[PDB]
Amino acid sequence: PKFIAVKLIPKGPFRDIPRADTLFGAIGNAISAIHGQSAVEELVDAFVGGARISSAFPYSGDTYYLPKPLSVEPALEGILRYTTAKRLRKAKYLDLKNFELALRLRPFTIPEEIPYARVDVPRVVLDRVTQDSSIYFWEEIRFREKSGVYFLYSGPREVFDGYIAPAMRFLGDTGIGGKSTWGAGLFEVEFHEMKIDAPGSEYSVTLSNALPTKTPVLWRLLRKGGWSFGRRKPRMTFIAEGSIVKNDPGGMERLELGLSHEVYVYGLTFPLGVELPEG
Amino acid sequence: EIDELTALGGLLANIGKPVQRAGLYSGDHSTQGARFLRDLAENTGRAEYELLSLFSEFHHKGHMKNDELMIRRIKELSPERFGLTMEDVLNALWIVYEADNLASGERPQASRPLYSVFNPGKAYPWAELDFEKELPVPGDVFSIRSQDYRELVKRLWEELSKAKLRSDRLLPVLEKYLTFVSSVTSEGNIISLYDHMRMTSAIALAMLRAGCTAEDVRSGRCRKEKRFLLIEGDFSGIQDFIYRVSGKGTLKYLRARSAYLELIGWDVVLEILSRLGLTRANVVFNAGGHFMIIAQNTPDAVKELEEIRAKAVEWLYREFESDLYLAIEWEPVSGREFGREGGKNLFAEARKRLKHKLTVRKLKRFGEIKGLFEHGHTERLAECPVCGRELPEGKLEPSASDPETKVCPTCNRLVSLGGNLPKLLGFGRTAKNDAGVLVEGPFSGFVPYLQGGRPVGEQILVKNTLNPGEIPESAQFVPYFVADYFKKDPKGGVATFEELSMASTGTRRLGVMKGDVDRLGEFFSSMDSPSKLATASRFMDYFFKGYIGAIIEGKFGYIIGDVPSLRDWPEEPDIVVVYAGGDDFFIVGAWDQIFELAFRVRRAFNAYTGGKLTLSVGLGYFDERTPIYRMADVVSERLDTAKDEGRNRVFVVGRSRPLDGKHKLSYEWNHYEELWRTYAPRIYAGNGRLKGKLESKKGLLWKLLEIRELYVRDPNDVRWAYLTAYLLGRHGLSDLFPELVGIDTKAVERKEPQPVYWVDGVLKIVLMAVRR
Amino acid sequence: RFYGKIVIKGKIKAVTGLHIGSQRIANPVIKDPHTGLPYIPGSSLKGRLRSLFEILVNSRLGEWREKYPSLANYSPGSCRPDNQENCGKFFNRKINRGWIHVCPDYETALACPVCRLFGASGKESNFPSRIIVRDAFLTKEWEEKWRAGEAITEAKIEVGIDRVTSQANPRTNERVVAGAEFEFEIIYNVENTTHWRDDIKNLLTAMALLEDSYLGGSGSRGYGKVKFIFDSFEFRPLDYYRTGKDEDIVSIDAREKSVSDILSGFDSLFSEVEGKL
Ligand SMILES: [Zn+2]
Ligand SMILES: [Zn+2]
What we know:
This is part of a larger assembly, with chains A, B and C. Chain A is α+β, with helices and mostly antiparallel strands. In chain A, 19% of the residues lie in helices and 30% in strands. In chain A, the strands form seven sheets. Chain A has a six-stranded antiparallel sheet with strand order 5-4-3-8-1-10. In chain A, strands 16-11-19 form a three-stranded antiparallel sheet, with no helix packed on it. In chain A, strands 2-9 form a two-stranded antiparallel sheet. In chain A, helix 1 (20-34) packs antiparallel against helix 2 (38-49) and helix 1 packs across helix 5 (157-170). By secondary structure, chain B is an alpha+beta fold. One zinc ion is lined by residues 101, 103, 109, 112, 114-115, 120 of chain C. Chain B: GO terms for molecular function: ATP binding; endonuclease activity; exonuclease activity; identical protein binding; transferase activity.
């Protein structure tokens, strides 16, 4: 399990931490520009076979953060004081050192500070003749000086360098969603290698949106829907990152939406092994 | 019937204790309650009062001797007047006997009152309920004079004569008077007399359903066998449900949601009670989207509880797109599992077996659906502009504000309910396909019982009063309390966001506070019997339900004292209690009275509890033009700022801090209320104006908050020490702020903030109360 | 489709101190939520280049009916006096109360010289923007003067004076300290090679107007005078994004001013682009 980490060093403030499906729709819309139409459907067949990506997760000066599994909650009492049993459960992200410990059900530590800060900036709308104001709020993720966001890739490198590494240079100059005409989703890219040790067992946490075919073991549910070319997507029941499946490959559902091409929604799981308690 | 006669048999058993502490007859209150129920059957009485004297007479085991005394007395008495069998009336005596021991636990001295559930050293002076003109503060112990117990009985003599002899009608009478009466006179008894008679009735109704007979109760088989079944549920997703609405529906709509959630909370609990054959005594508590019912362990009931749960959740999936979930779990216990055995608390670890089944079920958030992860693309859905639910087109109907927007159908029922809140006296639980129902629950429909109107339905929820005023004789009376203060507008209605802040002190702003009791889940594990937990979850319940109304009405100056207050409390304050659950509250209002209220709630809470539990209030200040889903988002994060630090501390103002970690933001409660005593009466006089000769120097207090901004870029610099001294010199104000002109060598060695760090929040409240 | 991305970089020189504000010193400038350095939003610079280019077209709604179609469907002026969307007049989008020019569909927005570049939503169409106005932050020379003890904001107290009795009514305004340097970045997208030319002529025209007008704030009391110093023109072709092999067309404008770049250097510096398109 040596993962090609893709670091996204932000320029302007992101609209959100990109979900896994925000990325794959961004990547597919890149390859429809820098590779034409037929290479995107070829890209979709590559992720069906072996290739998997993950959701984006923050990083703070090489200290790579990762989602906390839901494997720790049913037996957090078997780990370890009541104040510690809540602040460890309330958390959302764990460090790369501490994500490996909770896969083996070891005692561990939460991070102290979160890198990003969801701030809300007020903007205004002005008519051109009378300069009369019309306020509306707006809110976006604002990252710190060193920090940023990354995500993972595991698969054949001839699919990486052929597809993703072009797309993450085209997506450095048009954003990953949000009001990317205000310089929101823009970044610069550097690639790395990253290693997470997984204990061999039949249960697995998913580092991306699961969208399962069979019912998982323990799952934090998530409802979101996208926007392809001005067309609303229906709300789908993805699972959030860090839920536990047993031998589930996930899936992608093509959607109609009245476009010239079919539109796929990435929900392929990203399994890393986990040790579950009794239930 | 034979069912209900055992239900009142446990409920009316320990009566005789309130006639014992007077001394109308001799001792042995089982002999007293036999005479107290015999003479009530004489005048203005039914026939059961002679027969319900049997239950009070033969408990405590001094009266069932050789199983032989019980028969000859009731050989003369006639059970055929209602059709009771000679042995089946003997059966109900044993069942009340065992339930009289199970709710009690391991257990006369003199006449000690109700010792308080938070400090068992202190006690309650005896008082009535209804939360009006009285705050029961646990004070010094005073054994009650026996002359007081005479007028208690005569008032109870009259109230038992009027009320229908029925299980749901004696409960609001016994809760009215015997709430503050101790059951067993002992050292630090914190078990009330209402609850000890209520759980005695609650268990006896389950022992009848479990299927035990008289000699099985006599044998040791009925205890130490799995026959009881602790149902417990919880709503997970309340704060993500009420507050996630956009900039529509200002405060008539949020106040409608928070009572809509309580309807669903009762529409499930009352569904469990009817389907299992249980009364309202079998509810241990129900507050804040979390209940607990004691029930029987049959194979028959567990078939029913899976039907209740699967029908609730599939309602909560279509009507709300997985925003709210009702996780119901049960666990079979034995009889011995209630009381403490040895030194080990069996009831806590039996509650940990049940709370863990909650924690797993909150993870598998929608498991019993089977169309959950199924995908079917339906043509052309759209979403609501108010609440953001996705509906198919055509179901979106025009609103009650503008015909331009196309809101949910379930929002127009909550705007119309948003106007019917002052014109309201309760709800009526009735069938789904009825006329006049605003809102539907997971099992039934709720008709509004207005100001002028007649109640309709088979069960009638009645808000904030325990007396069946205009209720028919056939109906069931289910009283629920709710924190319900609201400032009325010039009309007869609920205030707006944009009314409260125009009528505020100083500048205009909306003052949201959201605070909650800390370490409360560790507190309810201290209890070790169903008598003890039903009390502690009810006295904690009535603070945020009833006694928070009397604080906002402006009372109890002896208990509270003086708070950090910009102006003295008005007659009709402009405060809108959105939600207040029992562990939690969320109150909006005029932003310089919410500031005054938070120190007025905390002060009264610290004397309601005997100094043992604390609040953590997270104050925010937001403009009227602000969507509520952001106001609850920022304030709850200002809550968890004041929660993870010390759990006894108030957030006051958004304040800048160094990146070291030594400087924590939110003020300790006692530490802040001396910063008001020093800083405020020397720079502020009251009612939004400043002290003498400090006017035309409001530029100064901004400059004094500029020097605080030099402490934040560099904490190590001592540039703030002389700039403090000089700016007070040039303006001639050398007398003000002596704590800030000099460094504190005591504060350096303690590694605590300097006194220029604390001055930000105490200056801004004085500054924002002036127009600034 | 996609051809390449003309990335403009350079420096913004706020010659006279400018103010933006957050509405929360009574009118504080916007800063970062962490470091506290002030900046220019991308929206306060896209919309300001939109207002100034909107008015110029508003005068020339007649003369540009042969160069651009979909201006024959407009007459100059607002639509405030009758609350009627897409009427005969030009500013036909009421956002909350402000009436802004936004074209309603695609095939009229493709010809309209504002909505083609700056972008327009409308109903059923949503023609996206073509420029990407990235934010502007202080130059590392000025990020270091932030660390060198200098104050980067300063309060100006203006007053309001009674005409007869000459009373004083002050107020405060936190501005950015005059003389500062912001480094900007404007990333055009080459969608169509037919009207490749005019969008760079119509963007630099809006900067000729922004250099004479103000950039937000009080402005007419003096708080604008933003000045553009260009440093790099690029092209970033479609060959570049496929492989990453650095063969992008670069035009040197290291000492070129924004009126010395429109025609003084526009045939000159973008001569190398026109062979590649
Ligand atoms: Zn709705
Ligand atoms: Zn246009």
